[PDB]
Enzyme design. Structure first.
Site, short mmCIF file in Angstrom:
data_model
loop_
_atom_site.label_atom_id
_atom_site.label_comp_id
_atom_site.label_asym_id
_atom_site.label_seq_id
_atom_site.Cartn_x
_atom_site.Cartn_y
_atom_site.Cartn_z
N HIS A 12 0.72 -1.26 0.00
CA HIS A 12 0.00 0.00 0.00
C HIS A 12 0.74 1.30 0.00
CE1 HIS A 12 -3.49 -2.45 0.38
NE2 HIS A 12 -2.92 -3.07 1.39
N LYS A 41 -4.71 -9.55 -7.97
CA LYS A 41 -5.48 -9.04 -6.85
C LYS A 41 -6.60 -8.18 -7.44
CE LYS A 41 -4.80 -7.14 -2.30
NZ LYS A 41 -4.45 -5.84 -1.57
N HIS A 119 -2.57 -3.52 8.08
CA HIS A 119 -3.64 -3.86 7.22
C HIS A 119 -4.30 -2.56 6.83
CE1 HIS A 119 -7.86 -4.98 6.47
NE2 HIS A 119 -8.20 -4.28 7.55
N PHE A 120 -4.58 -2.43 5.52
CA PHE A 120 -5.28 -1.27 4.97
C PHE A 120 -6.73 -1.72 4.88
CE2 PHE A 120 -5.73 2.67 2.88
CZ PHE A 120 -6.92 2.51 2.17
N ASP A 121 -7.57 -1.04 5.61
CA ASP A 121 -8.96 -1.40 5.75
C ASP A 121 -9.89 -0.67 4.82
OD1 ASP A 121 -10.87 -3.01 7.69
OD2 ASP A 121 -11.69 -0.94 7.76
#
Lengths: 125, 125
Positions: A12, A41, A119-121
């Site tokens: 990210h 992805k 983690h990119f939410d």
């Protein structure tokens, strides 16, 4: 192997970038950051902010991760980002992407120690 | 493992692009085509012509290979290339390249059967 903090960095973070709308930025980053091996992805987000600035989101507003359970953090201010989304015609190994720049607040899950983004939410505004 | 024909395809073919002068094309291509793992490739050339036209150079004008003597052919006409050059201050891991598009007749070593390209040898005119 690969630490969550590093995977978050490879998936990210694009600190020094300013992508053009539907250029091929996404096609080449997804490839180069290895999100197109074996499968393509579906969606991914890149952040054009300095690493530390993105790490300090971990000490900012507390909220709940999209799943409505986990603790996450929402940046206090919008950031420069790019949304990459796989095209319909794409058939692995051909992986194509619609490139979408925009200005928003990011939500991330933080952890480990030092306590950093893991983690990119999601995105907002 | 990786056939010479495939390595050449991955390292030098990109029919569907038209990079612009010092954009980040080369930084992403070199990465995505995997020329930046472990060491940063110093220089590399990309050809924006269809695969077959580039393959046809193998049945065109014979000339001497640069050093590594062994069947080189020079395109009959000038093709659209993009020269990627490592900037003098580039340090691995973040390989930084100078993107230079132009038109040159290309020289390629050809091999195996069918007779196709196996090395990008040089550029001319």
């Amino acid at each position: 192997k690969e630490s969550r903090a590093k995977k978050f960095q490879r998936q990210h973070m694009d600190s020094d970038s300013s992508p053009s709308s539907s250029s091929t930025y996404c096609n080449l980053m997804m490839c180069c950051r290895k999100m197109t091996q074996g499968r393509c992805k579906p969606v991914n987000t890149f952040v054009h902010e300095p690493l530390v600035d993105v790490q300090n989101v971990c000490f900012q507003e507390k909220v709940t991760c999209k799943n409505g359970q986990g603790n996450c953090y929402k940046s206090n201010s919008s950031m420069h980002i790019t949304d990459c989304r796989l095209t319909n015609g794409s058939r692995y190994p051909n992986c194509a992407y619609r490139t979408s720049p925009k200005e928003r607040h990011i939500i991330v899950a933080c952890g480990g120690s030092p306590y950093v983004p893991v983690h990119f939410d999601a995105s907002v505004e």
